[PDB]
Amino acid sequence: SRLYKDICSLRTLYGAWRKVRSSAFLSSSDEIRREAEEFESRLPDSLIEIQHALSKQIFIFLQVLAPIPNRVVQRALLDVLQRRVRLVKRVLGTPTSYGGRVAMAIADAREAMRTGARFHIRSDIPAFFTKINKDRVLELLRPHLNCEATLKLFEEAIRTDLANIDDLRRKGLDEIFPIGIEGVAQGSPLSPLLANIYLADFDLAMNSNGITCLRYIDDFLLLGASLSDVDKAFNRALKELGKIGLEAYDPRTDKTKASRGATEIGFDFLGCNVSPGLIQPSEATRRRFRAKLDAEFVAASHALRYNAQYQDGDGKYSYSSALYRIDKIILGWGKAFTFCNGSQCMIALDDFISNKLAQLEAEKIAILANSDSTVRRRVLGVRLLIDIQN
Amino acid sequence: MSRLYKDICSLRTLYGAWRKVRSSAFLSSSDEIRREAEEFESRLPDSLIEIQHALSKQIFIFLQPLVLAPIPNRVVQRALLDVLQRRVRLVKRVLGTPTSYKRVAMAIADAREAMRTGARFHIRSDIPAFFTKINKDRVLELLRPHLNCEATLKLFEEAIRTDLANIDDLRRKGLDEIFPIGIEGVAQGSPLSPLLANIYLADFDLAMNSNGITCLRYIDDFLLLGASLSDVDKAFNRALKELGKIGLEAYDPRTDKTKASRGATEIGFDFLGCNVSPGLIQPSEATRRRFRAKLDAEFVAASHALRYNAQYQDGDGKYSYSSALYRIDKIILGWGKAFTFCNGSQCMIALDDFISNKLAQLEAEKIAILANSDSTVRRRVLGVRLLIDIQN
């Protein structure tokens, strides 16, 4: 079919590889950034192998993140469907569905609270990607595709990757992306579309009767004028989720899995603490960031003593390299939260960074005092020409 | 369309061509050359397809302060080289010439073997204005029977007219500022230049390697090795007669002391950026002087950035204390890796002492600047961004 030939064309496949590349570089993990580089090292034959297998309708190549051949096929399947299929173009353009962004949902949440949304319930659909009915998804997609090859490809994308997105795998994504939920949408490009197809009825039913429901994949936020309205909304949501064999964490019985109460006091949403007036990274996100920085400064502190005594020190953690990589870690994290207006927590984080940097600077000075020139070279991270020749 | 020209236009050979062009850009120290390759990489799908498409249409306008050839021109030249050397008998033959270079380290290795077997004297010269005085029609004349494909032949001619024939003495001096061994820059900036030189000087290579005279040539730099000063003088005059046959010449060391060398091999001589002596191979004095000047430039930029980042809040960050020590470290890595075939340890130690000394000056200047400074100045000076500046 024209639909399947569009997925097999190297134009859309190569076009999908760039999106997979960006989603990887937006992550802190070096292994994910280097995995894209090796696939890139075979760029001509590596994507033609995918194209050839799709033409033969052989999907065995799909077997914390999905493999790049799997990740590219998912991205290539999405772009074609959203510009060729009316339903896919429709569910991805849902006003209350975000993912195909976090800043938009939080901006909409903030706007609602500024305009009467004084109470909220924020919950999650537990075990969403494992409890969703694979056969209902294919059922809802079959007439809109009219291509059993594309349907089987979508079916194999779910079986190999999407249905395996469990809570253990999601926790691995949180330590990789600054806003953890953005990892699912980018390690599995079909997950936003998969959730939008399965919860399209849920979205339509929940945005009514003065209740706003903002949803990002399987995380949703109910906003209302009174506590009674959001309480009625949550029970209405449990029934809608129950129609398709799903549930949601009750904030009244699972205090740590869901939130409930006034919006004026603030609540966590998509990795940020959202008040009607203040938007900042959540306490859990900042704790994760301070722990990431501590590990780099600890590694830099050990390398000061190692490079002063030994000549096989890894330059990656030398003084120049460590300060260089910590700078990039700060750049990547701050850029992910440029939509936030909380200046106090950023300055508090800056004081934490400057404090540990002062500890490292003072430690370097004490070690390099009365040291010889070659020791200063290994500690600061500037190679000796004689070592390269030896 | 012939199978030879379809091979050049295939994206597979165009991809292996650009991967080498990308690699050669990183082997250069110039940040502009490394970032120019990234801009062509920013359009990776359509950038190489535009070339593939225009080649199939035989439209070569895309080949048109720039020291290297443009990346589309550089890619096509590399693709033309890869296809020719594995398909044409002459091209694989002239590239596999024993006395033609097989990197610089092999030419220097062959020079040591000649000295090891009796070459007590030498003459090292250059063919001046080689690429501008090269005859376009003689090149096509030597290639036309071995190709049998006018499409590939006209593409070779347009590569010469747009890039190779414009490699003049002013542009070569720009290549020395970029690569540790300056003559390697010609091969990296214009991939077809070694093949073009080997095709043009094939008769010269055959005539010179005779009568007990070893002739080692790298593009347009050549070295004559013989048992006596009389032998290499006879050989140099034989080289002038051969170069005069094709409207070329070579610098006479007897009249141009600074353009060519002549004398005993035991006292040492400069060849391909290296000083070659009986047992000591090391970077030449000009190569070491050019390297110290590059390090001086980075430390000057690092020194000025300490003063700038301490006074102003729009610092580049590229030359901050951590970033400067980082790039200088890599500059030292790239320069040292290029002379791993050398065995002269005293000059590597002398350069290390030079590096350690400039590093001590910079560390002392940073200490005086950061003394009695606040935390925000130390952040800009050391090269650790502020989270509050990103959010603003």
Numbering used by the authors:
A (entry chain B): 2 to 64, 81 to 117, 122 to 411
B (entry chain A): 1 to 64, 79 to 115, 121 to 411
What did the paper state?
Bacteria encode a variety of reverse transcriptases (RTs) that evolved from mobile group II intron RTs to perform different cellular functions. In a previous study, we showed via genetic and biochemical analyses that a Pseudomonas aeruginosa group II intron–like (G2L4) RT functions in DSBR via MMEJ both in its native host and when transferred into Escherichia coli. Here, we determined a 2.6-Å crystal structure of a full-length G2L4 RT apoenzyme and a 2.8-Å cocrystal structure of G2L4 RT bound in an active conformation to a snapback DNA synthesis substrate and incoming dNTP. All RTs share a common structural framework composed of fingers, palm, and thumb or thumb surrogate regions that fold into a hand-like structure, forming a cleft containing an RT active site composed of three conserved aspartate residues that bind catalytic Mg2+ ions.
The structure was solved at 2.60-Å resolution in space group P21 by de novo phasing using selenomethionine. Unlike group II intron RTs, which typically appear in crystal or cryo-EM structures as monomers, the G2L4 RT apoenzyme structure revealed two monomers per asymmetric unit forming a symmetric dimer, a difference verified by size-exclusion chromatography comparing G2L4 RT to a closely related mobile group II intron RT (Geobacillus stearothermophilus group IIC intron RT, denoted GII RT). Continuous density could be traced for all amino acids, except those in two putative loops (Q65 to R78 in RT1 and G116 to D120 in RT2a). The two G2L4 RT monomers that form the apoenzyme dimer have nearly identical hand-like folds composed of fingers, palm, and thumb regions (RMSD = 0.83 Å for main chain carbon atoms), but lack DNA-binding (D) or DNA endonuclease (En) domains found in group II intron RTs. The thumb domain of G2L4 RT is similar to that of GII RT in being composed of three parallel α-helices (α1-3), but differs in extending straight up for 41 Å, 15 Å farther than in GII RT, and ending with additional short α-helices (α4 and α5) that interact with the thumb domain of the opposite monomer. RT2a is nearly identical to that in the GII RT cocrystal structure, but with a hinge region (G116 to D120) that connects to RT2 and is disordered in the absence of bound substrate. By contrast, RT3a in G2L4 RT differs markedly from that in group II intron RTs in forming a novel structural feature, a double-helical plug (denoted RT3a plug; highlighted in purple in Fig. 1 C and E). The RT3a plug is a structural adaptation that completely blocks the active site of G2L4 RT, rendering the apoenzyme inactive until it encounters a physiological substrate, as described further below. The structure of the RT3a plug and its binding in the active-site pocket of G2L4 RT are stabilized by an interaction network that includes salt bridges formed by two conserved arginine residues (R190 and R191) that are located within the 9-aa insertion and form part of the first α-helix of the RT3a plug.
